[PDB]
Write a protein that binds this ligand. Structure first.
Ligand code: 1RC
Length: 215
């Protein structure tokens, strides 16, 4: 038989510091792990600013969707928390450069420094995900390009491939498969309080969708 699907998959090694960093974040104990959701919402907001500011000069840039927002989708059945935004998105190359193989100065500094919530300033805030996730999947779609999937369980490497899933119009989808002991962030009350405490100044709509598959 012919496969329902077949696509090339590429594996990349993380730059050495970023990898050392992820182990740091994974194995060590930290107390305000909740700041991961702020870091990821924060990434979404900047992505939303870029598409927004580009549309000002080139209105067709929004042909792939006018609405600028962030959705938070807890799914207790999958034990996943997904952050979805309709920002500018990422090309395949962006995924490879910006999410693993290029380091940046803050990396060596940060590992050595202190409270974990500093990670936002050192520029590598994405990786705070692995405070609560054992695996992170990033689905992204940039205008005029394919939809891509970035994936990592933080073993020193990550994978990129074309995404066969459900088509996004534009933007980025981050899928946190949470550690067994971090399921609290699937909770509406907990999500609401983290957002109110750390993401109060985000100038885009933030909407929760509690997901439950029915029998
Ligand atoms: C990876 C580095 N890019 C960004 O943070 C933002 C960003 C920031 C400034 C300009 C363009 C873009 C595109 N991004 C994304 O597609 C994205 C990435 C992650 Cl990891 C996330 O959680 C949410 C996201 O919307």
């Amino acid at each position: 038989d012919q496969p329902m699907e077949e696509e090339e998959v590429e594996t990349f090694a993380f730059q050495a510091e970023i990898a050392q960093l992820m182990s740091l974040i994974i194995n060590t104990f930290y107390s305000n792990k909740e700041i991961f959701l702020r870091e990821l919402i924060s990434n979404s907001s900047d992505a939303l600013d870029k598409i927004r500011y580009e549309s000002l000069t080139d209105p067709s840039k929004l042909d792939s969707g006018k609405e600028l927002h962030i959705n938070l989708i807890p799914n207790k059945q999958d034990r996943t928390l997904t952050i979805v935004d309709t920002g500018i998105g990422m090309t395949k190359a962006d995924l490879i450069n910006n999410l693993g193989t290029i380091a940046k100065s803050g990396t060596k500094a940060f590992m050595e420094a202190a409270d974990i919530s500093m990670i936002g300033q050192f520029g590598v805030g994405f990786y705070s995900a692995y405070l609560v996730a054992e695996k992170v999947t990033v689905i992204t779609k940039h205008n005029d390009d394919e939809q891509y999937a970035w994936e990592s369980s933080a073993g020193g490497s990550f994978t990129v491939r074309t995404d066969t899933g459900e088509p996004m119009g534009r933007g980025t989808k981050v899928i946190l498969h949470l550690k067994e002991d971090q399921t609290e962030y699937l909770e509406e009350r907990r999500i609401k309080e983290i957002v109110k405490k750390h993401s109060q100044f985000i100038g885009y709509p933030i909407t929760l969708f509690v997901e439950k598959e029915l029998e």
